[PDB]
């Protein structure tokens with residue numbers, strides 16, 4: 542401890558008192574994430590600049606069994622503040638049809654202070670049933686995926702990205718109940734009910750506890766299989782979500798006519814719904830070391846054609862830990878994602894342009910045809926200490942916002958992760 546290579550905290554164990562608190566059931570954490578991005582070539586605006594965005598996360602993890610005598614119970618408090626600007630908005634995107642993904646995943650949801658987690662959790666029958674209640678985002682339990690890449694498409698719950706209008710990951714919180722049945726040490730099922738309340742997105746409501754503005758509920762379900770394949774760990778997720786809030790059609794007006802022709806309100810549907818798959822698998826163990834080798838990953842996502850802008854999404858990638866004996870804790874990442882836009886969204890746009898008489902893409906009143914956006918990242922993670930990782934990355938974006946008229950973007954990124 543103190544500032545050392547093997548402490549998982551930069552400030553160490555505070556002369557022992559941190560390790561005591563840990564024994565007594567208290568785990569206090571202060572985690573930092575900084576992301577830099579600068580355009581090197583292409584995208585909507587080719588004036589070269591750089592943007593920086595970051596996040597602090599202050600946490601309190603309580604073992605309520607030691608502290609209160611409550612048999613496997615846990616409390617968690619997390620507060621975040623985020624700061625900075627996003628390259629995706631400021632250079633890459635068409636201003637009237639912004640990028641779906643983002644070259645700085647850590648940016649978004651208001652750049653302020655938020656209550657990001659506040660929940661109590663208890664297990665029953667030797668950890669067979671797991672009940673969790675309080676405030677958190679869907680991605681924390683459902684459709685969960687790590688966040689080492691800088692590009693949004695390869696970080697966190699993807700359902701949270703493409704139906705992010707109602708499903709809100711970290712750092713947004715909402716009242717929620719999540720019930721989990723562990724059928725087998727390597728297989729579980731789970732369902733949840735999340736307050737769905739767009740006012741949580743408004744700056745000012747970073748610490749909202751009231752249920753005012755609730756539009757309905759999101760109800761995710763999931764099966765998560767974590768088998769060993771050839772002695773190597775994998776994790777496979779299959780899920781479905783259902784949302785009880787009203788959503789607008791992407792094309793039909795209230796009468797079933799194309800709304801681009803009428804200007805009347807969109808037809809309203811009483812719900813949204815979709816499915817997802819997450820798969821991650823370690824496929825090699827470098828020279829017999831389980832802690833090194835090649836891991837593959839994939840994500841697929843599918844959404845209701847009626848209301849969702851993103852039709853479907855796919856992502857494939859890999860990461861190698863410890864390619865070289867010299868740097869056994871370093872990693873190499875590569876990922877490709879495809880984000881397809883609901884064709885009716887495009888059809889509606891073609892109609893708009895037809896009716897405004899504006900057919901030139903360079904005309905501000907023209908409404909870009911959104912088709913398919915691709916993202917790719919290649920990164921290298923230096924394991925500086927156990928409390929510091931630094932990963933430069935290279936990002937490539939084909940048709941930002943799905944707009945073929947926007948040149949491919951080459952972006953340079955630097956992602957930093959540290960725990961104090």
Ligand SMILES: CCCCCCCCOCCOCCOCCOCCO
Pocket residue numbers: 865867868873919920921933934935953954955
């Ligand atoms: C900060 C923007 C710069 C772009 C980052 C580039 C990341 C892509 O590089 C990944 C591949 O680099 C391979 C490193 O070679 C390994 C050297 O280690 C050998 C040990 O002796």
Ligand SMILES: OC[C@H]1O[C@@H](O)[C@H](O)[C@@H](O)[C@@H]1O
Pocket residue numbers: 645646647648649650697701709710711712713
């Ligand atoms: O709320 C979900 C997601 O929204 C994005 O704006 C943030 O940059 C992500 O860090 C976050 O995971």
